[PDB]
Design a protein around this ligand. Structure first.
Ligand code: PLM
Length: 131
């Protein structure tokens, strides 16, 4: 988990609009989230991980323990049952609600942080640079 720690900034985004759309977000919000480049901060204290997402539009913060289910309310205002795990070197975040699911996967690939969001048939890829 240690190489994930620190400050990272958004450098490239692909297919965010289809993802948002598949989840049910409105056009007006979509406009706004597409011009925005967030800051992500990953910290640790013992066995508790903290995840901050900062932007000029919306801000979020969660704290958890790997492999333990927790309640979360997302940036688009969903209320879900979540669990985060380490699988083959990757940081896998599973969210469940109303009988449906979405995955958020983080990978370190040649100096960089790569995030891939999957919902239904839609798949989005986002890359971050270490600040
Ligand atoms: C998440 C950045 C703030 C903008 C929110 C736009 C509304 C869509 C919500 C999608 C939920 C997760 C998106 C995470 C984006 C990211 O971390 O790169």
């Amino acid at each position: 988990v240690d190489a994930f720690l620190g400050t990272w900034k958004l450098v490239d985004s692909k297919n965010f609009d289809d993802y948002m759309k598949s989840l049910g977000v409105g056009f007006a919000t979509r406009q706004v989230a597409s011009m925005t480049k967030p800051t992500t901060i990953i910290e640790k204290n013992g066995d508790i991980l903290t995840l901050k997402t900062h932007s000029t539009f919306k801000n979020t913060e969660i704290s958890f323990k790997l492999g333990v289910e927790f309640d979360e309310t997302t940036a688009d205002d969903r209320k879900v049952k979540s669990i985060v795990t380490l699988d083959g070197g990757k940081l896998v975040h599973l969210q469940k609600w109303d009988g449906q699911e979405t995955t958020l996967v983080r990978e370190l690939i040649d100096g960089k942080l790569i995030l891939t969001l999957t919902h239904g048939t839609a798949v989005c890829t986002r890359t971050y640079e270490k600040e």
